[PDB]
Hints:
Blueprint: H1 3-18, E1 22-24, E2 35-37, E3 43-47, E4 51-62, E5 67-70, H2 80-91, H3 93-96, E6 104-105, H4 110-122, E7 126-132, E8 136-140, E9 148-156, E10 162-163, H5 169-179, E11 184-186, E12 189-191, E13 200-202, E14 207-213, E15 216-221, E16 228-236, H6 242-256
Parallel strand pairs: 3-7
Antiparallel strand pairs: 1-2, 2-3, 4-5, 4-16, 6-9, 7-8, 9-16, 10-15, 11-12, 13-14, 14-15
Helix pairs in contact: 2-4
Bound molecules: calcium ion (CA) (2 copies).
One calcium ion binds at residues 34, 46-48.
The structure holds a DNA duplex.
PDB class: hydrolase/dna
Keywords: restriction, modification, protein-DNA complex, iodine phasing, HYDROLASE-DNA complex
Assembly: trimeric
Amino acid sequence: MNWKEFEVFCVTYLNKTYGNKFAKKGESDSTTSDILFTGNNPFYIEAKMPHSQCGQFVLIPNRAEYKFDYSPKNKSEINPYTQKIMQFMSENFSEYANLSTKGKIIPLPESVFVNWIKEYYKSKSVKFFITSNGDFIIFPIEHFEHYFNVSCTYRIKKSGSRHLNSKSLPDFKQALDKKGISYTMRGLELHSDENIHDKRISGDDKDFLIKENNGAYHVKILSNTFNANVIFSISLKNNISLFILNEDRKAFEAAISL
DNA sequence: CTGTTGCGCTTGGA
DNA sequence: TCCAAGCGCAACAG
Ligand SMILES: [Ca+2]
Ligand SMILES: [Ca+2]
């Protein structure tokens, strides 16, 4: 099951287990957290698979002062634990300034990454997490360090796609007939009896990607932005104390019965 | 509109 | 199992 299906299974669970007081937000919506408890004390619940990533921030190398600068276009403010990650990479500037796709691990105490995550998700009014070990686990942001091991790497992450627009429709068809694919287009919708799912087409300084949806084909334009970001990874601890499990469930049931 | 960027998401290949 | 890596989305500037 993919991560989209997993979010749906968590919302479905909460609604049947506790009542339909849980609203699911957009899947790939960067602005907010996953599930909004629409009760008398609203808060957010964050869904994460057993192996997930856990937030990020962009750092721009500044080769003049040989330090890393927090990008002003970031969406989360600096907390103390951010500055401690920056200071480490800055004092190791020579090795971290050569940005990589495979990334370079940050070998800092796990204490730092856990506190950054707690601060970051508190900043989104997340009070509880939900995940699964075969059975659904719900725990408050305060006890995060008892459920996940945390890793941290600094890597280039190319920015996301955008829909094919009218301006670049003459250019897309240019690249299509150079590859030999026959097609017809009703507006921006693509139609073909050849299967070109996830075919990548390129030419004249845009890169195109073809996707199949609703019995037809959608075209996406790929990005040109290759900034590096500190990014956190989490993995569910395999044997968890049943002592903390029951207390944290009681904490959730208390928080929604309020 | 058109293009850039940062955050969402584990995913896919070895 | 372990390691490498970017597209789907909204905000923002223009
Ligand atoms: Ca989300
Ligand atoms: Ca989530």
